[PDB]
Write a protein that binds this ligand. Structure first.
Ligand SMILES: Nc1ncnc2c1ncn2[C@@H]1O[C@H](COP(=O)(O)OP(=O)(O)O)[C@@H](O)[C@H]1O
Ligand SMILES: Nc1ncnc2c1ncn2[C@@H]1O[C@H](COP(=O)(O)OP(=O)(O)O)[C@@H](O)[C@H]1O
Ligand SMILES: *SC[C@H](NC(=O)CC[C@H](N)C(=O)O)C(=O)NCC(=O)O
Ligand SMILES: *SC[C@H](NC(=O)CC[C@H](N)C(=O)O)C(=O)NCC(=O)O
Ligand SMILES: O=P(O)(O)OC[C@H]1O[C@](O)(CO)[C@@H](O)[C@@H]1O
Ligand SMILES: O=P(O)(O)OC[C@H]1O[C@](O)(CO)[C@@H](O)[C@@H]1O
Lengths: 444, 444
């Protein structure tokens, strides 16, 4: 009824004249033998939830273990008859759960990913008890895969080169790790939604996503997690990101708008076409925004492309078509507010980087399902997408560097994405702007 | 490179100077005993896919059967020893599949929902053969539920009042239908993803959504279907929709903008508050847009609410803040184009109803997961949402009637939504505008 508009995020809020006074968090429990992609799922899911704004953190019991033990000697550390190490392993689990408690009850976290094997009913029972007693929801993710080819390949890809094997050649690293896995085999009790685990909320991922069993999804975040797990795959592939060729507003320093390519932006577009041909890709999808400059760039390729409105550049609202010099002059306060809080700032009647993230989510979801893809887009859009793939925070996203006429080439390696930059050697202007009391204290 | 902007949808396209020259469709196969919600899933999924723009149609073999037989006498028609009727039933299935073929190969349909029991391997095999031979993808949805309470309740809710029982009282309708179900029991072969159905793409829905088994999702549309099935529920509930109280742009005939409530819009807001209290709901969620007028309306309720940017009113781009009389005067061609194709039309630098649908999809998905919800929104937004619940086409959506100060109350009944209108007796202006050669032929 009486409301004021917040100056940064442009949100209407009730005017509070007295500010002097005055949906449980969730633990995701990983389950499975070693080298089943538990840690891979932990990190990727966490990169997703963070980028869409649900604060999430991975608690990797193995890293608590390395912290406490220092150098790994061999699989003998994991024998079920190793009384002292079984004890230390338990201690690492319980220290991880203490931090889980602190994260969720004290540091404003919403999702805690408890990444360990959790292969016995007894250990899962204790985790349930800890969640109940603290009022957290529990959701279980079990990865099941007995294909020896996938296990072998997982070991080569992430295990022989982990810190546990700093000292090792490949063949013996592999040999140690195989025996380490067989340590857990005799006591492993897979999740059983028919009998014993009927009242648990869970997903079983089977044969790398070929099949899934889902029991009792409870809420908003749980059903998204399941949809996300069902749409990612481990096939190797490549993602290319770039901006439209230089346009005429770029030549004028003007933001937003819908102008066409300059003669350089056009020369870039032919360079992009030769570059793509030289990559020699089997099938390649091409995506653009609905703005003219990205579409003119894609036409030079002579490949089919799809236009997405969700890839249009951030909307500057009343500042569209203006230069930054015009904005500082006409809207000095809006100018200063954007520089102090560039992620959360919304242009009047336009958008923030925060809004851009929400709108790009379906683009990200579909990119997960594709193989080879080239995305021709815009400066602020490209920073968002890059923040997702490279795991950058919200505070750094609006400052990521993404110059004109340069392709960022992303390849899946280990637990994330390697980025490689290829500048296509066509000049263009620079659109990157770096991050930028006296009277308001006494002795005025 | 050389492109033109389409006048209605504002899409850049290559200029074609010679227009004189020049991802398989999918059959969804329903599977299950009678009264397992197959038809319910068929219709609801189809209402969803159509509203998000994937042309879909239900082929209900039972309706082919009623067409061909005329009056139903009893469950004896469904006996496996009824040689002549087994023949006619088969004929209805094959006539349905012919129409499926015509819909998908000839009428531009993309998804065909084949709604029948399909309870034997032999019948499913023939459907596979028909899909293969025509190059369609096949995806199976099996509903499994042996809770006698749910079956009984499903029969009371949709079967005793179906056309098959026009002639009948409740007890005997129920009795006939129970025996009809037991006709199919002996030969029923549930989908078996372990052995026989390992290479099929399928979802098994178990105990009304308590549990799911998912085998080999293949593509974009299949993974959305699964996510949609996992998020709807049959618990009874109520959805309320209305607009912000009247605002000052409403008093001026002006479109878009961010103005506050008039004194009437405020009187409506207290009326809404008393109305909500009189409904006596257990928990009620309240959603608004981020525009001031909806938020001022929600404050009068003194209940917690959530603001969604996706509920903001359609964006009129360069025409924001203008009256319709100013738009006709300054942009006569844009005015005329919008009147001739109101769904697909996009305001320059703004949106169409088509864009509004894409942006509201997450709102619809989340409404599916809720129980009691009140959505305070805007004229064009409210028509979109109402088109989804009431199954209206794209061509009618922009003309649906949704006056100020009136709540639309939606309740789940049978296979859809009943709508009830409650006007809260506060005057307001009217914002509804109805749908509106000579020189371009010779004898000029
Ligand atoms: N669902 C899955 N099943 C089996 N392997 C997977 C799965 N998802 C990812 N991977 C592979 O798992 C490997 C990483 O294993 P890691 O996450 O370190 O396993 P863990 O934590 O279970 O010991 C990567 O090679 C990745 O490709
Ligand atoms: N997954 C499900 N399992 C069981 N019943 C359901 C399911 N989904 C909806 N229903 C109920 O099914 C009833 C409608 O049955 P109907 O679709 O006519 O069944 P069928 O087509 O299998 O004969 C409705 O009462 C609805 O609430
Ligand atoms: S199902 C709960 C568990 N009980 C059993 O394992 C009995 C055998 C299985 N239930 C079965 O065959 O059905 C349980 O709590 N086990 C404790 C453990 O640590 O193994
Ligand atoms: S699995 C393919 C089917 N063969 C069988 O049913 C053999 C028995 C089961 N496979 C089993 O117990 O594993 C099949 O095609 N059956 C044809 C039918 O119409 O029943
Ligand atoms: O967030 P920033 O750095 O202002 O960059 C986004 C701007 O960059 C541009 O893409 C090019 O200058 C403008 O169209 C857009 O407003
Ligand atoms: O699609 P239509 O009928 O022009 O209605 C949408 C318009 O209605 C209003 O909500 C109220 O007039 C405007 O804010 C908006 O532009």
């Amino acid at each position: 009824l009486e409301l004021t508009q917040s100056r940064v995020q442009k949100i209407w809020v009730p005017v509070d004249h007295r500010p002097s006074l005055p949906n449980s968090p969730t633990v995701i429990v990983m389950v499975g033998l070693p080298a089943r992609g538990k840690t891979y799922i932990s990190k990727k899911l966490t990169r997703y939830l963070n980028w869409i704004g649900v604060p999430t953190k991975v608690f990797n019991v193995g890293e608590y273990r390395r912290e406490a033990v220092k150098q790994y000697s061999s699989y003998n550390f994991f024998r079920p008859d190793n009384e002292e190490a079984m004890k230390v392993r338990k201690q690492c689990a319980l220290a991880a759960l203490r931090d889980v408690k602190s994260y969720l009850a004290k540091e404003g976290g919403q999702i805690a990913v408890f990444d360990a094997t959790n292969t016995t009913r007894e250990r899962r029972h204790m985790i349930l008890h800890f969640a109940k007693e603290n009022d957290f929801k529990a959701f279980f993710i079990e990865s099941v895969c007995d294909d020896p080819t996938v296990v072998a390949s997982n070991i080569m890809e992430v295990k022989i080169s982990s810190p546990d094997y700093k000292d090792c050649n490949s063949a013996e690293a592999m040999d140690d790790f195989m025996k380490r896995i067989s340590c857990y085999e005799a006591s492993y009790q897979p999740l059983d939604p028919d009998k014993c685990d009927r009242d648990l909320s869970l997903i079983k991922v089977i044969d790398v996503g070929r099949r899934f069993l889902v029991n009792r999804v409870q809420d908003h975040i749980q059903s998204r997690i399941v949809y996300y797990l069902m749409n990612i795959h481990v096939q190797p592939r490549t993602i290319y990101l770039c901006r439209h060729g230089e346009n005429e507003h770029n030549l004028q320093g003007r933001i937003g708008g819908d102008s066409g390519l300059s003669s350089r932006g056009k020369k870039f577009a032919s360079a992009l076409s030769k570059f793509v041909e030289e990559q020699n890709l089997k099938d390649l999808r091409v995506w653009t925004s609905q703005l003219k400059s990205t579409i003119q760039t894609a036409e030079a390729l002579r490949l089919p492309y799809e236009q997405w409105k969700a890839l249009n550049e951030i909307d500057a609202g009343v500042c569209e078509e203006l230069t930054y010099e015009e904005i500082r002059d006409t809207y000095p306060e809006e100018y200063a507010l954007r520089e102090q809080d560039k992620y959360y700032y919304r242009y009047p009647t336009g958008e923030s980087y925060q809004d851009l993230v929400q709108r790009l989510e379906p683009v990200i979801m579909e990119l997960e399902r594709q193989e080879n893809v080239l995305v021709i887009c815009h400066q602020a859009v490209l920073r968002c997408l890059l923040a997702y793939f490279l795991d950058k925070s919200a505070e750094e996203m609006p400052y990521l560097k993404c110059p004109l006429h340069t392709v960022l080439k992303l390849t899946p390696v280990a637990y994330g994405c390697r980025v490689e930059s290829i500048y296509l050697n066509v000049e263009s202007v620079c659109t990157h702007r770096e991050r930028s009391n006296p009277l308001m204290r006494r002795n005025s």
